[PDB]
Structure formats: structure tokens, C-alpha cells
Amino acid sequence: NIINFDTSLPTSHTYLGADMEEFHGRTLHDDDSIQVIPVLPQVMMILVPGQTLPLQLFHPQEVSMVRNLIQNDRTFAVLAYSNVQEREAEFGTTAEIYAYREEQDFGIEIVKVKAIGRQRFKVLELRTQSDGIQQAKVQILPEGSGDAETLMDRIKKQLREWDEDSLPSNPIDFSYWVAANLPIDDSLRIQLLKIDSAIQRLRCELDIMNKCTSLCCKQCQETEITTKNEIFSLSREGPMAAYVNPHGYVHEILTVYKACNLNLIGRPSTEHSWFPGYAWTVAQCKICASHIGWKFTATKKDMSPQKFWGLTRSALIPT
């Protein structure tokens, strides 16, 4: 309930690298325009405009694609797969690289990037080259706003009950902040993205956060892991942010203060820690033993909070 922590520290993704080449030029595709944007193969998430996405690529094809993209408009396509295994996606969001680093070592050539969601699109064609790089023929969607600040002042009211402003004031920007930080599942995330007007998004987004109770283990159905009132915001991105592990896997985690039915595996560690100053420990379900997230404990008595949890969306479902 008290915070001694640079909340703007997790957004920097210091674990990735000390200093990376920043990029300031901004590409924004005109409304209803048809573009050919390449797709990163391993990324399997629902990206929201403004959501930051970190990446660590080791395959020579991914390195060759992003090395090429850096010299151009630095924009790749993140599809919102309707079925993950079937590669079936009809919508998606563009991602613009704003940070980049070329590290060798480990015998391989690596590229670490930090992208951010820009604009949604409707997929027209999804064609794969002979090498393997997937290219997407997409149609940029238009961004409608509207006059309904009462809806924003109602979202902000229930948001502050679960955690104690500094939120976006733009009705459009705030509509996507809510879409990226609410503990909703993928199917609901797509419904928010398919919505065109911010008024519909904000009016809809009000409808779910009243029907959202608690989060339970996916493999277990009825194992209450945390409630909608334990949400803690330790980052400027909010209570929901994406972080990449040493292997390159992106985890969309949620920061909560109290969690139940969780077993910690081993002793705390500070290696590659996503929250500088804290140590991590693998948290597992008590019954089914499926990985739920990580327990973060402070390494100093001067900082606060002393403990919190970061659980991934892929292991939890609302109930």
C-alpha cells in the first residue's frame, strides 16, 4: 500500500541492455490504406495501440528481417490470432520499433528491440515466403473518438477502487489503455479491438469490468489465484505489461499484491529480473502444478512493497 520504487523503471526494460539505439521518426499509415507489412513469426499475442512489446530474436531469419526493417520504417505486424495453432487471424495491430541493439556473444547474433503498438488493421492476405518470413497485406483501420467523458470518469472511478491518476486524458488513448490493462481473456480482447469508435470501446469496457470477479488457474478451472482488488501498478504501462525472458519468450504479466494457492519453486533470484531491485521466484499452482507466474520479493528493507506477484494471462482465466 506504500511504494518505494521508480515506477518508470520497469518500462525501460533494463534487463535487455544498458543503452539501445533510440529512434524518433514516426510512421503513421493513412486511414483505410492497404499496406504490405512483415509478420514476426514467434510473436503470439494480442497487441494494443500504445502497448509496449519487448523482443529478443536469435533465429538468423528474424535477425535479418529486423536488421532490414531498422533501415526502413521499423514497423512489423502483430496478428491477433483467432486460433493460435491454425495461424488464423483476421485483425491485428502494427508495432513500431523505437529501440534496438545488436549483440553478438553466445556464438549467435542477437537483436533486442522494444516496439510499441501504433495502429490496428484488418488482414487481407497472409502469404509466407520461401524462406519463412510471413508477409501481411493489411488495411489500416480508422480511429474514432466521441463525446462521452462520463464513461471515462466512470472507468476511472472503478479503476481507483482496485488500486490508487496519471492516466491518459485522450478518449482514444484511454480507450486502449483500458483494453491492454484489464484482466480480460483473449476473446474479449479481440472484441475491444474490432470496435471502431472509442465510445463503443469505453462503453463496452465499462460493461466487462463490472462482470469481472477473480482470476483462476487455467488448467484447474476452480482455483482462485487472485481477486480483482489486489491489482497493483508497479509500472508506468500499468498493472499489465509484457516482458521477455532470456530465451526470448514474451510474457504478459499482471502485478498483484496477494495471491493464493501458489507454490514457490526454489530460492529467489535476481538474474534478468524485470523489476530492478527485486528478486523472482517461480510460482506454481498448488493442485495442478502448472506455472502461473513469479513471486517478486524486495532485496532491501528500504523499498516498498516488500512482496508482490506477477502472473501471466496465459495461465489464468476470469471466473
Binding site for Zn ion (CB under 5 A): 217, 219-220, 223, 285, 287-288
Based on the shown chain and the rule CB under 6 A, indicate whether residue 87 belongs to the binding site for ligand A1IQT. no
Residue 158 contacts ligand A1IQT per CB under 6 A: no
Return the residues of window 283-302 that contact ligand A1IQT according to CB under 6 A: 291, 294
308 binds ligand A1IQT (CB under 6 A): no
Nearest to 87 by CA among 123, 119, 113, 62: 123
Cα separation of 185 and 161, whole Å? 21
| 92/113 Cα distance (integer angstroms) | 19
Q: Which does 217 bind (CB under 5 to 8 A by kind): ligand A1IQT, Zn ion, none?
A: Zn ion
Residues 245-264 that bind ligand A1IQT (CB under 6 A): 245-246
172 phi and psi, to 5 degrees?
A: -75, -50
Alpha-helical regions (H) of 71-126: none
The Cα-based distances of 68 to 251, 260, 295 in angstroms read 26, 46, 38
Q: Is 44 exposed, middle or buried (0-12, 13-18, 19+ CB in 10 A)?
A: middle
Cis peptide before 305 (omega within 30 of 0): yes
- Is 285 annotated to bind a ligand? Reply is yes
Q: In the complex with Zn ion, which residue's Cβ is closer, 290 or 304?
A: 290
Partner touching 91 among Zn ion, ligand A1IQT, none, CB below 5 to 8 Å by kind: none
Q: Decide if residue 282 touches ligand A1IQT (CB under 6 A).
A: yes
User: Binding of ligand A1IQT at residue 26 (CB under 6 A)?
Assistant: no
Task: State yes or no: 177 annotated in a binding site.
Answer: no
When asked if residue 274 is in the footprint of ligand A1IQT (CB under 6 A), the reply is yes
Binding site for Zn(2+): which residues?
217, 220, 285, 288
